[PDB]
Amino acid sequence: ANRMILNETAWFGRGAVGALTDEVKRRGYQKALIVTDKTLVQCGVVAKVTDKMDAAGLAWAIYDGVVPNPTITVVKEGLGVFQNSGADYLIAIGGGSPQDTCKAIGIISNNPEFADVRSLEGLSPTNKPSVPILAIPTTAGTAAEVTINYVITDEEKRRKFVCVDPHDIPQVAFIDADMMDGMPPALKAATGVDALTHAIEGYITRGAWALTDALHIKAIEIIAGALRGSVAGDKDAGEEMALGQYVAGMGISNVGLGLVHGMAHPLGAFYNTPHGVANAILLPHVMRYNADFTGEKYRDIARVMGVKVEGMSLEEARNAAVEAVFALNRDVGIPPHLRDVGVRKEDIPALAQAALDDVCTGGNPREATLEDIVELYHTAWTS
């Protein structure tokens, strides 16, 4: 049988964070720790929430110590701030980095033997649900509000590790494009292609089945339709991206991903490469590698990305799907090669061994060898 974990409650649309104070009052929670980053405080995005909480008389404290590719240090520090705050629930405001940090804090707070953080890697055998989490994404996006995953960086071991735990699922998600509009174009582009990567990898993952296929192909259609418009600053395209990125995530932790995420994680660990940029550069090269192991699915991908697939052979349609992703990457300004973003050619064997051992790689529809992953890094590294 196939398991689906989803948010029991989610609010969608501009103004969705307007539902938060009523959700808190109905659940009887007394005090939030807001888990976020310094940028979202400074840009006034956190105030969009705390102004409503103040008006409603709801107490909060803040941890804004999250940094991109959050580390064991960031988690332990946040846990300390949570313990001292007296908070009884968590509000995650931000992209994947604050949402994942918030998941780690909420899990460890109710499962304190996991305070080393490393021991959470894999299918975390936690006895207790997380401290309740209300999740508010500000990127479009990681879908961290709806997955059972969180990704922590072990700086000492120079690796990203994935923690997979039904106990971390947020109680309520608020998917509000008002919270996302401040993303600079380059961040809309990067997080948008991360969302497309979730949807494409989830569509073709080894565990794919009818329900996740339906969700993923819809998310591909929405994201391919909206991303150029959103990067260009269109408000309605931004709301479409907010939905598309969430739908993309409804499959991620339920069926899995593949070698794009597998190969992106080591770049984040080695260089602190933004997750979305790493995925975007790798995506079309890994799609080419996987093409002949995906049955009819690249014809579907090409079709919903606006390719006229009628009369194409399956091999032509597969090529067309890859070219449609190359074209989207060029149009939204993703750097074309890994060498552009400071990846070192001599690190490729170490990156390739890290990618081969990454949990995401196991979902890849083609069984990757060390040599295959080395060649893929080389293909993505330079013209």
Add this chain to the structure above:
Amino acid sequence: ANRMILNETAWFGRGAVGALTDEVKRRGYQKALIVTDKTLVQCGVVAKVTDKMDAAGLAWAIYDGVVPNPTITVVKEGLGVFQNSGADYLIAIGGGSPQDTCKAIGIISNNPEFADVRSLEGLSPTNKPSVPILAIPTTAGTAAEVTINYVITDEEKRRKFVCVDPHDIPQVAFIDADMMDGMPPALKAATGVDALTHAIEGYITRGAWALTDALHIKAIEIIAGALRGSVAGDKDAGEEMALGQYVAGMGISNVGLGLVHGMAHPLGAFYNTPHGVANAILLPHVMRYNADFTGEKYRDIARVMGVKVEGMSLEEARNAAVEAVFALNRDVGIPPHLRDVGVRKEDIPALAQAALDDVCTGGNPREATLEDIVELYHTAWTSH
């Protein structure tokens, strides 16, 4: 903004009930009350679950008093059994009637001021979540496992009332076609067109938006593709129907339905008409009534039901969608007329007023008058 309430955890596929014992152990629950009906005991469907619970050493008691179109009396009886069982959680085994009874028991147990049951109608002002519910559907189906609704019959007032409450959402749903295979063909057919009705009414409902449109149009495609095979006893078609009926429910309480459910409820209240059969007979007639107020959506319905809509006018595509539903009803043996299931012509004005006031009717894309609903009942009743 649009709210979606869904199951936090759901298991899908043949053998999904195999996940139940590990779910109970993980949540630390001590003793189940199983809420079900006598048919499911007799046919050995309940034993498919209790044998697994017995094997895993999990304690259970049973209330098997549920009847179709469950009454206030059935809710109070089941509540008494729950109170005296020492159970700390609920397992709903059955179609909409057991799943709705189970929601009522679970809500009233943690909100004991609603023991009169009538006080739950509408947006139930409950303060506490239901006793935790693990939902196992045996029809395909009402999708009661994933909605926040439950429908109770007030025998004294001869009416069905809808209770709407986020507090009633089951914690886990187990959607297992092994639990559904034993439905008689006529019940597969009726519950299957009820599922199609949820998907079609949900697709065209006034509150429809992008996410529910995507889910509903997929559910229509799955159900239209699978229902003939499932009724005929095809194993894979049965598994497809188990998924399609669930997806068809992901909008029932999230966006709403319309006049098919609005007109079906009074038939249940007046005659004890099976919910599925009532909806199946009404569906194509109400679709015809609604057609010109549904934008492009019947072209989408016609397309996923196998109609070649290329070069069709919008009205040709609408007529083809309606014809495809009439054809499916004939093809799985739904009775053609309300007269065939004992609906009385002289009751139509009373049925029409009840339908006009039904909560479901508010979602209908065409604004229905009493006179419109009287005429629709006549169209669905007549052998002409």
